[PDB]
Amino acid sequence: SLHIYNWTDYIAPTTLKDFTKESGIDVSYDVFDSNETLEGKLVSGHSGYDIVVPSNNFLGKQIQAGAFQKLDKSKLPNWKNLDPALLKQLEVSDPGNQYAVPYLWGTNGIGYNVAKVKEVLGDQPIDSWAILFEPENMKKLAKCGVAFMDSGDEMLPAALNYLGLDPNTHDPKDYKKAEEVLTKVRPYVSYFHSSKYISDLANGNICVAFGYSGDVFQAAARAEEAGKGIDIQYVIPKEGANLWFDLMAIPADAKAADNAYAFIDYLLRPEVIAKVSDYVGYANAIPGARPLMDKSVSDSEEVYPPQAVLDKLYVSAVLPAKVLRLQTRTWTRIK
Structure with missing residues (x-):
């Protein structure tokens, strides 16, 4: 066995x-x-x-x-x-x-319901972390359901990178900036969960999610097999993303x-x-x-992904315990 x-x-x-x-x-x-x-x-x-x-x-x-x-x-x-x-x-x-x-x-990125996002956001390109990290977008998306990961390791470095900061930074000033971004959109996040978003995307319970590449692709396949015309797409945003x-x-x-x-x-x-x-x-x-x-x-x-894309991505570093504690405390305050 x-x-x-x-x-x-x-x-x-x-x-x-x-x-x-x-x-x-x-x-x-x-x-x-x-x-x-x-x-x-x-x-x-x-x-x-x-x-x-x-x-x-x-x-x-x-x-x-x-x-x-x-x-x-x-x-x-x-x-x-x-x-x-x-x-x-x-x-x-x-x-x-x-x-x-x-x-x-693979990578992390944004998984989204094409039709539903177009309905709330119009015919704009879905190609930036801004979709999840700006209140201007999220206050509109909230109503159609939004999932974030249940993980400081995922969300904080993503927010850091969105702000142009080192996702692997040791700097508490940077973490406070990332924290601010995340806290400002929290009221719009439907839930923090790292797997529920697959079935939710597939059946239309949510319209957008922070997600892992293959997970999003699985959701899109389930949505096609469902036969309800749900179009799920995955995007590695222009600011880049995690390569793991x-x-x-x-x-x-x-x-x-x-x-x-x-x-x-x-x-x-x-x-x-x-x-x-x-x-x-x-x-x-x-x-x-x-x-x-x-x-x-x-x-x-x-x-x-080809080299032009791999060049925008960040690999997560093996961090010192001190920074991991900082990351944890920051996430708890948010979660």
Whole structure:
């Protein structure tokens, strides 16, 4: 048996069935919708999981905390399937990539109901964080429903970047500026939640959301399958946005490590990770998977962004505890 703690909506419907059928390893699969939730479960050091899937910045802090056991790469024959350039980018969080294996990666941005936003805002381009961070826009959108993430790590750096400030800043003066932006639009935010926004966008309960790329794409697909003419779109705003990577790691106290290795090695296979990306709308770190993927996914400049776009994006830094406390206190006052 194998216990996995992963993000919501982050796997294909038959990925687990296919693995179990091929390996004879059964899976207990639990989900969370925010890094803060996972971090909560790891802080104890007894979160009895064999695989967990933190983002790059959280992974860095958890490695410093000794949350994970070092990878025995001999039990990952498929490691050589990984993009070396991407592995190098993650070494900032995991020097020598000793603890974690890239899984999926993507951006945050704005997901929105085209018709409903046009109705409240007219025929203007939806291409700025201003849509969510200016009261002039939000006071109008409020009535049709708006979702923000339940996460300081997401919202504060986004607001900072919108203001032209360093999303990874250590400066309390900057955090107070970001706080002000967020507090001013809070009355218009329907709710803070990091997964509810998918079904809400799909069925029209909300018109706009702060969202992750693939999540928004899943919502748009559900909306098409619904057959009610709902058009959901994802936008990486002109001010740029977060570029993040999710990675699988094995808790230090894991009971079934060998089973964890089998699972991860299975996911490093091009045809397996292709099916996942095809379903969830997120890029993977396996160059061999591209030729096998749906062109609708691989040829999207929002799933796989070109250099002109990647240049506007910020990667979340592994921050000192002092700044993370600042971030937390600021978010609580807002939330």
